[PDB]
Amino acid sequence: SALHWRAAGAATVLLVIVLLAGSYLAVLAERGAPGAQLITYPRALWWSVETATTVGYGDLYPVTLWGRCVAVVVVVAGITSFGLVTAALATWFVGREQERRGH
């Protein structure tokens, strides 16, 4: 269908991939750093979801450079993807409002 709905879909699939890759890379970057908690996959995945949604619980976060880099990619992909949906919903509303104006 329309570009905005495809982009939304694409963004979602992409986000889910970043989430998974992010979980795997966080563990890899963090293991080896004393005091690190982002070291098992199940919670790292919870961490990536937390991060991508910016929910801010603060129960887990990276302590290494590479882990922080992985964090930036994840949050940014999350902010962007959700902003994309917002933009897609606006395109939907703007298009329907034009119709409701018989023009």
Epitope: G32, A36, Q37, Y41
Partner: antibody, heavy 118, light 106 residues
């Protein structure tokens, strides 16, 4: 069947250096980590280090003198541990274990009794 | 590093009694503790993961409890086959660490 296989023993002369092996079998995920644990007679379990085969990245217990080096042959599903310049202090049973990246060692090898002696 | 204290080091129980092994961490670690059993000259065997989750193939008389810094591994009605060393292990913070262990004695 036996998921981890280690040679029962290895004899090493002081200053020498042996390479222990750990052949794995059963379900193999990319997320698997192989750990190595040292147990001196009488004493308890001491974590040595870890390695993730699907990347070759390894980490070591930095609280103890570093005498190990880990590598892994993805082809033959085998983990290797290179111990170098051993002394009487390095004689003990070395276990290897498999961790599915979720924090616990589900399965351990039978362990290799390394004896450093002339 | 996270210190895992197992005290007392030796437990003397009578056949059939209920025994309780203790594991105290130096800092809070949720329920990220795991229990292993090691018999004379055998290798470690996972008995309980994440503080209280039973593992398949382990006698129902084995259980664990606790969270934070105090953990307990309990055995309802001990028996000769249970004679061994019991270690706790933590996966909350890097690196993983093991308690010093407690020997069960009947």
């Amino acid at each position: 069947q036996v998921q981890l296989q280690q040679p029962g023993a290895e004899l090493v002369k002081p200053g020498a250096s042996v390479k222990l092996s750990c052949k794995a079998s059963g379900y193999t995920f990319t997320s698997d980590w192989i750990h190595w644990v040292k147990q001196r007679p009488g004493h308890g379990l001491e974590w040595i280090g870890e390695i993730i085969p699907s990347y070759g990245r390894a980490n070591y217990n930095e609280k103890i003198q570093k005498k190990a080096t880990l590598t892994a042959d993805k082809s033959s599903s085998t983990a290797f541990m290179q111990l170098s310049s051993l002394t009487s202090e390095d004689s003990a049973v070395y276990y290897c274990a498999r961790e599915r990246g979720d924090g616990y060692f589900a399965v351990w090898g039978a362990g290799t009794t390394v004896t450093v002696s002339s | 590093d996270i210190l895992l204290t197992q005290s007392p080091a030796i437990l003397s129980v009578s056949p059939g009694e209920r025994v309780s092994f203790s594991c105290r961490a130096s800092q809070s670690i949720g329920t990220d503790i795991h229990w292993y059993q090691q018999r004379t000259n055998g290798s470690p065997r996972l008995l309980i993961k994440y503080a209280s989750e039973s593992i398949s193939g382990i006698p129902s008389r084995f259980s664990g409890s606790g969270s934070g810094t105090d953990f307990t591994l309990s055995i309802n009605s001990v028996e000769s086959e249970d004679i061994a060393n019991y270690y706790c292990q933590q996966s909350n913070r890097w690196p993983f660490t093991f308690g010093s262990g407690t020997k069960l004695e009947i």
